[PDB]
A paper describes a structure:
In Escherichia coli, the main RND transporter is AcrB, part of the AcrAB-TolC complex. This secondary efflux pump facilitates efflux by using the electrochemical proton gradient and besides being the main cause of MDR when overexpressed, its physiological function in bacterial cells is to export naturally occurring toxic compounds, such as bile salts. The physiologically active form of AcrB is a homotrimer consisting of three protomers, each representing one step in the drug-extrusion cycle. This functionally rotating mechanism is shown by each of the three monomers in the asymmetrical crystal structure of AcrB: access, binding and extrusion.
To check the role of the hoisting-loop segment, 860TGMSYQERLSGNQ872 located at the N-terminal end of TM8, we created a shortened (truncated) hoisting-loop mutant by deleting the three amino acids Leu868, Asn871 and Gln872 (one turn of the α-helix). In order to address these questions, we solved the crystal structure of the hoisting-loop-truncated mutant AcrB at 3.0Å. In general, the structure is almost identical to wild-type AcrB (RMSD 0.70, 0.67 and 0.78Å for access, binding and extrusion monomers, respectively). Surprisingly, the structure shows that the entrance of CH1 to the proximal binding pocket is still completely open in the access and binding monomers, similar to wild-type AcrB. The shortened loop flexibly retains the same length between Cβ5 and TM8 as in wild-type during the export cycle by unwinding a part of the α-helix. Now, the random coil region is 864YQERSGAP871 in the access and binding monomers of the truncated mutant. Although the channel is completely open in the binding monomer, in the extrusion monomer, we found that the loop was tightened and stretched compared to wild-type AcrB. In contrast to wild-type AcrB, the loop was not an α-helix extending the top of TM8, but a stretched coil from the top of TM8 to the bottom of PC2. The rest of the protein domains were unchanged compared to wild-type AcrB, indicating that the truncated loop was still able to act as a gate for CH1, facilitating efflux for certain compounds by opening the channel completely, although the truncation of the loop did cause a significant tightening of the loop. It also shows that this significantly moving region of AcrB is very flexible and that the deletion of three residues (about one turn of the α-helix) does not limit the ability of movement of the porter-region sub-domains, nor the energy transduction from the TM-domain to the porter-domain.
Author numbering:
A (entry chain A): 51 to 200
B (entry chain A): 551 to 900
C (entry chain A): 251 to 400
D (entry chain C): 101 to 350
E (entry chain A): 451 to 500
F (entry chain C), H (entry chain B): 751 to 800
G (entry chain B): 51 to 100
The structure:
């Protein structure tokens, strides 16, 4: 729910300020979205040990985690060593109308995605959609009526 | 003749091939909405299933994802082609198909829609291409730098001979509904800011409460306003907060509201604010010539604004045809030392 | 939520609608128009594309039996195929190049036994080359294959 | 490297038996050197910046960049970066019956960045035409703003701002290091080498970077070099290569 | 000499050339060994008497 | 703690850059041993206790 | 104080679904139990640098 | 939970060394289901419910 500048000035910049002393680092670059998301990319000199770089980055990231907001923490922060191009996109549909889109997509996230994303040689898995959550959709009139807040 | 043609021949890296696949990108203007970008995604998917149905097999369309970064105004479409065999001809390869489609989408009503090919080794670049970071080298802030950036574009347009399609990679600023909580009025009325900010944020933002188990899998639990009360500026006053009085105060009894511009994608380069700019050298003229010019335009930007090359345009000071020089000399040494001579080499080397 | 002091109850359902729904609702995907989801997969730095893609479709095959009736996998965008056919159309061109060597030692020698000292010689140093590319740790790729062809 | 790993793999054992107080801050695992490779010192030439202003400038616009520059280990800032420094007077705090407890609460309350969602957010009501971020409270940005932080409203309607109980200003985060270049106020980066790297090619990177930043300096700031170790190297190579051509003539 | 140099065109592109060259030079190192075992001995004991 | 030692409260943005916010006693009031008697803490009954 | 299901559902699952993009892993396994403890153990390929 | 399973509360220093500090219930008061009735808990009232 955070807006771009809120992300920048509470996640992005604190993380950036702790990317110190990380061998063969050519440049660093980062986006902070209206969508509440930040991704920072550290790009390393060629033939750098990609496993070591990650360790090295994640090290410094760890020293900064305590300073991120609980909410950014609780959503899970990640450091991946990926290729930026999609290797492929595996699709999933429903033949017989027994699953909605929301349902198909939940099934994927919760039966497929984890297995795939542990299969060695797979840097990142993007889910085109969402895992289910329990949704409480507050009514403000009904809430006020009973003299209640969220 | 050999020395003539040589100097009159272009110098690419690896040919862009037809890989069975390609991608289309959709960016709608900011303000846009999910349902409006789905219109555009349909017209994209349509073009490929009706007009280019001899060549296409699958379009997998994603509203909300983008090559750019996430958001409710962007989309992408992955496109699969029939086998190479089943589509013979050069007007049935990616090169053509992407061109036709891009041209075709060119008249999509207000949305950048661009079909393009996978480029051999993505990280290594588009031949005539450059990638440019403008930078808040000290203090300025988003607005002063948006302007610096504008200056730069405006003036690179004034050299179509050397530069083409110089453009920002980022996003233009868009309106934003600012809300002030007046601290006095709140602290007067008996409402903490803690309850104020939680109520606003949870309702309109959504809020991860705790986990629960759905069919034996731990999953998040979220609280948020039903969509109806979260759509319009007015809906702000639907929301009430309980003071220590016991009494439900309107939001509108401790709060102003006003429209303000701001960025939806703040980008940063090596640790400080930036704005990425892409473009190519003009047809004929080379990239080092466009880069030279872009640095020069860059030179005349306002105080506190710098630049940096990055990506494909980052440092190529390596390779060299000085190792062509050694080659024929070490070829020489070894023809010489074969023929026990120093004129018998010039026989073959020529 | 509360017990109204008159005796009444305020259950959560009386102030909010409650359903399973996405963690998120930003992302929505169709497949030739039909509602869908899928996994966009990016490859890990240095991983092999072809191995990783097989690994995935192994693991996906592990899952198909246990899908819930109606669900179907679909393959809308794959990098690997071309990498695999690119190499094979070369390895075809390399055998064709032997077959056109063999037949221009017959407008040029005419002993079947002698048109064979060449046509054997080529294959024996190729297959040795592969062993050396193996020694130095190289892969079989579009540059090493065009190596052999030249 | 493979020894930072192993050290970090063994520090995991100790990790939770250390107090949560410690586990905030954090534990570094740096491949360390000891001596300084060099010390870059910054001074001001024309009275437009103090020792504390220079320090904050160096930290906020040079140290970050250099600590990522090609080759460098730890960087040491000789001075500190600014912070918002609320200096509270215990008497004025009594006058209104207040405590540092009330001051910190207020500060957390009114200097805060708050996520407030958006209009036209997903999932929407179908037909929605606009979507824009809802911005609320932001972080404060100035001493005036921190001054105006309400602490309490008195009985008579009159208000106790934060400037009523405290002196507000930019200051350092610590006031412990204080550096001087030939008697003159300075700050400086004390650069360390990164566990085997081309100290010669490192210092020319540090120096090449410093030049990238030089044109954006404020009027009066001047980099100076009170302590490079690399000229000794550069020369010592000449004076053995001097021998080379001496000996091959003799 | 005509090849091994390009196996050191290093940086960025380098490994594209490094792959090509080392392939072609390894293939020549094996060519002589073929011309110094199989091409001679076989000529002796394959192509007809004349 | 906040008085004699300082306390990092939260952050702010100084000229486009997140930096720290500190509360601490002014110098006058944390220099002598006697100065401990300057601070009052407030009991829950609304009155200030030295 | 925890029991296998408490331990599994608050600790084991959360970790497991969170072990990703680890290289050369063959399989992994968990024993969330009623002493109030869990162990998860990932097994790698032969040759993996441990 | 504290009574019947035990809480980890915090640390202390025994003989120059850092060590945990649990509070459980005295074993006798957490053996069998009738033991539950032994325990009580403060309300708003400020009485002791069981």
């Amino acid at each position: 729910g955070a807006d771009a500048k809120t992300v920048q000035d509470t996640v992005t910049q604190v993380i950036e300020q702790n990317m110190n002393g990380i061998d063969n680092l050519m440049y660093m670059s980062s986006n902070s979205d209206s969508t509440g998301t930040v991704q920072i990319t550290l790009t390393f000199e060629s033939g750098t040990d990609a496993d070591i770089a990650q360790v090295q980055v994640q090290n410094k990231l760890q020293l900064a985690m305590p300073l991120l907001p609980q909410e950014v923490q609780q959503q899970g922060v990640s450091v991946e060593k990926s290729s930026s191009s999609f290797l492929m996109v595996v699709g999933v549909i429903n033949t017989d109308g027994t699953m909605t889109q929301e349902d198909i997509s939940d099934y994927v996230a919760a039966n497929m995605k984890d297995a795939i994303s542990r299969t060695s040689g797979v840097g990142d898995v993007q889910l085109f959609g969402s895992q289910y959550a329990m949704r409480i959709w507050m009514n403000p009139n009904e809430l006020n009526k009973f003299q209640l807040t969220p | 003749g050999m020395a003539y043609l040589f100097v009159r021949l272009p110098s690419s890296f690896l040919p862009d091939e037809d890989q069975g696949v390609f991608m289309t990108m959709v960016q709608l203007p900011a303000g846009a909405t999910q349902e409006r970008t789905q219109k555009v995604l349909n017209e994209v998917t349509h073009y490929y299933l009706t007009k280019e149905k001899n060549n296409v097999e699958s379009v997998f369309a994603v509203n909300g994802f983008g090559f750019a970064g996430r958001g409710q105004n962007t989309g992408i479409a992955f496109v699969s082609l029939k086998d190479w065999a089943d589509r013979p001809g050069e007007e049935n390869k990616v090169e053509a198909i992407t061109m036709r489609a891009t041209r075709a989408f060119s008249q999509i009503k207000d949305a950048m829609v661009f079909a393009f090919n996978l480029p051999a080794i993505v990280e290594l670049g588009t031949a005539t291409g450059f990638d440019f970071e403008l930078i808040d080298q000290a203090g300025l802030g988003h607005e002063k730098l948006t302007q610096a950036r504008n200056q730069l574009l405006a003036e690179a347009a004034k050299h179509p001979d050397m530069l083409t399609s110089v453009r920002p990679n980022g996003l233009e600023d868009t309106p934003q509904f600012k809300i002030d909580i007046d601290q006095e009025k709140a602290q007067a009325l008996g409402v903490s800011i803690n309850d104020i900010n939680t109520t606003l944020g949870a309702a309109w933002g959504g809020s991860y409460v705790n986990d629960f188990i759905d069919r034996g899998r731990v999953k998040k639990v979220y609280v948020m306003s039903e969509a109806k009360y979260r759509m319009l500026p007015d809906d702000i006053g639907d929301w009430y907060v309980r003071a220590a009085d016991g009494q439900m105060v309107p939001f509108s009894a401790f709060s102003s509201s006003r429209w303000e511009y701001g960025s939806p994608r703040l980008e940063r380069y090596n640790g400080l604010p930036s704005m990425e700019i892409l473009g190519q050298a003009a047809p004929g003229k080379s990239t080092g010539e466009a880069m030279e010019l872009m640095e020069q335009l860059a030179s005349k930007l306002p105080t506190g604004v710098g630049y940096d090359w990055t990506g494909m345009s980052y440092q190529e000071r390596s390779g060299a045809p000085s190792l062509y020089a050694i080659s024929l000399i070490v070829v020489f040494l070894c023809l010489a030392a074969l023929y026990e001579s120093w004129s018998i080499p010039f026989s073959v080397m020529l | 939520l509360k017990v109204n002091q008159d005796g009444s109850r305020v259950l959560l359902r009386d102030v909010a609608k409650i359903e399973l729904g996405g963690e998120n609702y930003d992302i929505i995907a169709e497949f030739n128009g039909q509602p869908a989801s899928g996994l966009g997969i990016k490859l890990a730095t240095g991983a092999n594309a072809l191995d990783t893609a097989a690994a995935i479709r192994a693991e996906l095959a592990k899952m198909e039996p246990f899908f819930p009736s109606g669900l179907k996998i679909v393959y809308p965008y794959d990098t690997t195929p071309f990498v695999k056919i690119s190499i094979h159309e070369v390895v075809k061109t390399l055998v064709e190049a032997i077959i056109l060597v063999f037949l221009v030692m017959y407008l040029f020698l005419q002993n079947f036994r002698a048109t064979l000292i060449p046509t054997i010689a080529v294959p024996v140093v190729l297959l040795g080359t592969f062993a050396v590319l193996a020694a130095f740790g190289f892969s079989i790729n579009t540059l090493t294959m065009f190596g052999m062809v030249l | 490297d493979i020894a930072q790993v192993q050290v970090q793999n063994k520090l995991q054992l100790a990790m939770p038996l250390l107090p949560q107080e410690v586990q905030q801050q954090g534990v570094s695992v740096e491949k360390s050197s000891s001596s300084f490779l060099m010390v870059v010192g910054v001074i001001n030439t024309d009275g437009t910046m103090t020792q504390e202003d220079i320090s904050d400038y160096v930290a906020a616009n040079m140290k970050d960049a250099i600590s990522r520059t090609s080759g460098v280990g730890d960087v040491q800032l000789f001075g500190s970066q600014y912070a918002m420094r609320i200096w509270m007077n215990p008497n004025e705090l009594n006058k209104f019956q207040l405590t540092p407890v009330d001051v910190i609460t207020a500060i957390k309350a009114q200097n805060a960045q708050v996520a407030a969602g958006q209009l036209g957010g997903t999932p929407p009501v179908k037909g929605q035409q606009l979507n824009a971020s809802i911005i609320a409270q932001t972080r404060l940005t100035s001493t005036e703003e921190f001054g105006k932080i309400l602490l309490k409203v008195n009985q008579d309607g009159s208000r106790v701002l934060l400037r009523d109980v405290a002196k507000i200003e930019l200051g350092g985060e610590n006031y412990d290091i204080i550096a001087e270049f030939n008697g003159q106020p300075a700050s400086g980066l004390g650069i360390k080498l990164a566990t085997g790297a081309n100290a010669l090619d490192t210092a020319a990177a540090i120096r090449a970077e410093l030049a990238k930043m030089e044109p954006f300096f404020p009027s009066g700031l001047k980099i100076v070099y009170p302590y490079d170790t690399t000229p000794f190297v550069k020369i010592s190579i000449h004076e053995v290569v001097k021998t080379l051509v001496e000996a091959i003539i003799l | 000499a005509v090849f091994v140099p390009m196996a050191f065109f290093g940086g960025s592109t380098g490994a594209i050339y490094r792959q090509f060259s080392i392939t072609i030079v390894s293939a020549m190192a094996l060519s002589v060994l073929v011309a110094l075992i199989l091409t001679p001995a076989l000529c002796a004991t394959m192509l007809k008497p004349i």
